[PDB]
Symmetry: D2
Subunit: 317 residues, 4 copies
């Protein structure tokens, strides 16, 4: 039997006997993602070049507007916005959403894969909604996932019931369920990080990468892949296994990726898929944020691979 | 004035006062590329999953390119990554061109939605003999046209001819390649290097030294950033657009490299050269290698000329 | 604020505090309509003509499979199938659906507008589902409407809250609400029927049509339009006002159009729009069917026009 | 073997050993039609209705105008949308005159009736500076003509010396696929098409002819009637299924209603190349010598037996 994202989400919502607010949220997000996909694939660019005589801004506007008009949210955090957006009282629902509307867009000029990252929290207090409502550990996530605009467009959705992958069929504008209850390989064969920063590496990262190229147990050296677009690199890690690292460097003593709308959602996707996500010192999802745009280092992926990194990290204390 | 691929090729062809065969070939290829793009983006996948109650993407791509080229009446010999022997076009449909292509490069990892691409190189049949596989045994220096389609965040066709390199964005709303970047040139020196560093234990000593110099610059310059998608079209395009260097060099386990000369290396070398870049095997220009086997491999280092020259300096230093 | 079909239906469902089965039904139906639209616009026809070296059956299969897989239906009546389709027990829900999956398809060779017509009933008895659960008068309809595959694709959805029109944006595959709570003109200026068969007209039809062409007073004659596709002619009647006739005659004393999946859905839409729909002797929606494929005469459209027709009809009765 | 619009046209041009200007014009027209189809099907309408927080006939006109100018193949353009002939700037002048209706039937698009684009292509005949007069040629002089129908699917119908060919737009890939080669219309059909709402104004010849279709004097089967009210849709059905299409003069339109330059002549040319007929009653449409770019004509067109039958009645009434 075929299944779509909205039908899948409605069935789960009707099972849980919820109010329907989360379903409305996820449906609105789905609409926004289809619109972002259409723009990313350059539908209508001929009009820009004069047939009849931006992108990260448009993406942000699409997610902002669809989430506001969902009547399901009260606080919105975007990579694109300096302060938290507070929804007007008339359109408020109970959820907080942190999102990166077009991750990797800085390199979109070379048509690299790009993506949308989102994480959903329930507002916990009876206080007036404020920026601090988004300062929750990733453990509190109700849902998270990403849309990858790669060779094809796919939405990966993680909830308590696990991780599910939906392929956007552009012929009919429907997300089709193609991978149910996804789990990541226990051990991979690919490591993913920017080795251009080798001079700035923590000794623990240096040692670990050396182990990937020169295995101590006579196994084959790992392959290296680094797209430089987080959603693309993390998705490949989910599908084929292995390990993704964005550790600290000289420019980024707290890492470079953003905790709320980059690290936490992927960490949630990884953990719900049987993977792991760590800063080195603790689980990503256990970090308690104090600033909506704060950075965190992240090592994530297949559990054996992450544990091997953490084994190395602890050796260097 | 807006400009499209087919219109651009027609005007350049009318300038050259050619017979129109090359225009017909390229327009047929453009149709195949649009069809490959549609299938790659998974149009119609709902039917595969039972919405109404099947070929692999690289087989479909090959069939699409094969059929459109045969029916263009502009070709006589077709070399595909997918086929052991060159395909000889039927006599009724023969034209004067030989085309070597990789119909869907990078498809082995397509399960993770990595960018993939189509690569092509176009030669004129040089001999008066009846067409045969030997007609594809030409150095890249003989290319008439070459280029690639990148199926990335958007679909783009990069086309190289004597007049230079031009980039066309596929507008999927209307099925037209729109000219968006004219007479494209690569940066003289870049800041990114691209190769699979996981196989470092097998590196040639010159490759080890150069990569070390990019990470630990001896002259107090900034270290280069690293990017490696692992799909040749994606890495080559990023190299073209942002500058830098792409390497799949020879090593101890692979003394001739891994990438294929006819339908991977030569077209990408041709594009680099028309854009002011460089492409070498280490020993010589990729376009100067004289192939002896249509599926032979060649090592390739390509990209910004300053970066490639710096690599050859290290390579010659280690003899 | 933008509004889509599934979001519209969800909010209406949350107001009614239903179980969500109807919402799942309508979302499933919407998915089928987008797929029918894509096929009707001939997406992928290049493959049929050899680029790499029926339509009403596909449409029927699309609606059938989406409705079965919704877990919302138990009996399905289709123009394409001799007998009622009984949903297997594991997939049974509470609704009965009557539909014409591709109406007007007999003339699709000329690319004439085509459409999908549907009517949704609540199963009334606890008996085992059977053909008899579809023998309900149109008065019992829960929802009805049609999809028009014309210059653009539009879904017209009629419920208790009135008639609403949704335009398919094929760039993103979303039905966008473009006309809310539509009402038909009290009186129109267009009559619609096949005048080529005038020799067999009932004398009342002959008189009424003559009055449209040769008005007894100083008014303008009505214009004539007859697409020959019921969905197209009925939609124009809804949009511009006027009257559409497929009446009974001596050779066809029960009309030609089918009650369950042509007349009743359109009659329901007309009545929710402030229009009228009659067989000549009674309202279409009051006919109690005895056969899932039974025919009915139908005259529908603007109320002043349908009443004027009934004046003439009663004169010859 | 598969064939596309551009490939078909190129092959015909290489056979004719022409300069390539007509191929370029037709390729430019094909692009504009695909863009018109996309807008007609409402791609991107969600943005108009606020998803992120031109009228179609104006847009259609801009698409055709801009694509034709930039083709470098035209010198004078007549559009239903423009009061005067548009003269191409000298740098972009080519040898062809094009008369077109960029979105015919758009007045009823609110009900999603099929709409279409109609075009007729002439070679500029005089050596004078390009002017509005270059479009005042009889349809007999047409080099190419046709239409795109935005119906259930989008189809481009193209008539040239080699006959009539029909290309279906595949929206998945944006390619017109040749699906019906060298099309001919049925010698006699079973459908007549006209707005009988003007029955009180009909000349006796039309009234009599229509009576014969409904009540045939030989007691054969009566014709069925179809009238979409969008000319491209009605003429296309007439081409595909045979029969007869009529728009005669009436009191509101004593010179007929349809436009000679960019409605009657192109359809007349397609009909004639398909083995059909197209008449004003008095003469062949293609023989009318126009004096005004927006002038109207009565038109009766379709299957040859059916139009000849109309003309017998017409002559009977003098
Ligand atoms: O959507 C609903 N309920 C619902 C939906 C329909 Br249709 C009809 C009746 N009820 N509840 S929810 O809280 O939004 C939720 C969504 C997803 C998940 Cl996994 C859990 C909870
Ligand atoms: O197509 C033509 N000529 C041509 C085309 C038309 Br339409 C009308 C008249 N002439 N010549 S060609 O040899 O194919 C060629 C194409 C591109 C380039 Cl860059 C060079 C050569
Ligand atoms: O969907 C629901 N309820 C619902 C939905 C959510 Br979300 C959360 C809670 N309840 N009810 S329904 O029976 O499907 C229905 C649909 C449309 C209409 Cl007009 C009436 C009834
Ligand atoms: O296009 C050409 N020639 C042409 C085309 C290519 Br490709 C390569 C070389 N020459 N000539 S044309 O005048 O445009 C024409 C088009 C269609 C028809 Cl039926 C007749 C005449």
């Amino acid at each position: 039997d075929v299944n779509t994202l909205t039908r899948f989400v409605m069935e789960e919502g009707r099972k849980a006997r919820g109010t329907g607010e989360l379903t409305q949220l996820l449906n609105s997000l789905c609409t926004a993602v289809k619109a972002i996909s259409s723009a990313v694939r350059k539908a209508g660019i001929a009009h820009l070049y004069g047939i009849a005589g931006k992108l990260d801004v448009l993406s942000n506007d699409l997610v902002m507007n669809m989430l506001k008009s969902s009547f399901a949210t009260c606080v919105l955090v975007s990579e694109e916005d300096k302060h938290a957006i507070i929804v007007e009282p008339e359109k408020r629902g109970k959820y907080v959403v942190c999102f990166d509307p077009l991750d990797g867009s800085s390199n979109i000029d070379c048509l690299v894969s790009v993506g949308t990252i989102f994480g959903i929290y329930r507002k916990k207090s009876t206080d007036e909604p404020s920026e601090k409502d988004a300062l929750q550990p990733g453990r509190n996530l109700v849902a998270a996932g990403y849309a990858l605009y790669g060779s094809a467009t796919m939405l990966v959705l993680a909830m308590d019931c696990g991780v599910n992958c939906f392929m956007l069929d552009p012929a009919i504008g429907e997300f089709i369920l193609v991978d149910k209850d996804v789990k990541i390989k226990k051990k991979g064969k690919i490591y993913s990080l920017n080795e251009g920063y080798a001079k700035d590496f923590d000794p623990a990262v240096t040692e670990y990468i050396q182990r990937k190229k020169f295995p101590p147990d006579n196994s084959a050296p790992y392959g290296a892949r680094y797209v430089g677009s987080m959603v693309a690199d993390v998705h490949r890690t989910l599908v084929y296994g292995g390990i993704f690292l964005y550790p600290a460097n000289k420019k980024s003593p707290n890492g470079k990726l953003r905790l709320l709308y980059e690290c936490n959602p992927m960490a949630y996707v990884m953990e719900k898929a049987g993977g792991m996500a760590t800063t080195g010192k603790e689980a990503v999802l256990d970090v308690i944020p104090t600033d909506i745009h704060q950075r965190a280092p992240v090592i994530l992926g297949s559990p054996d691979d992450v544990l091997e990194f953490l084994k190395v990290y602890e050796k260097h204390s």
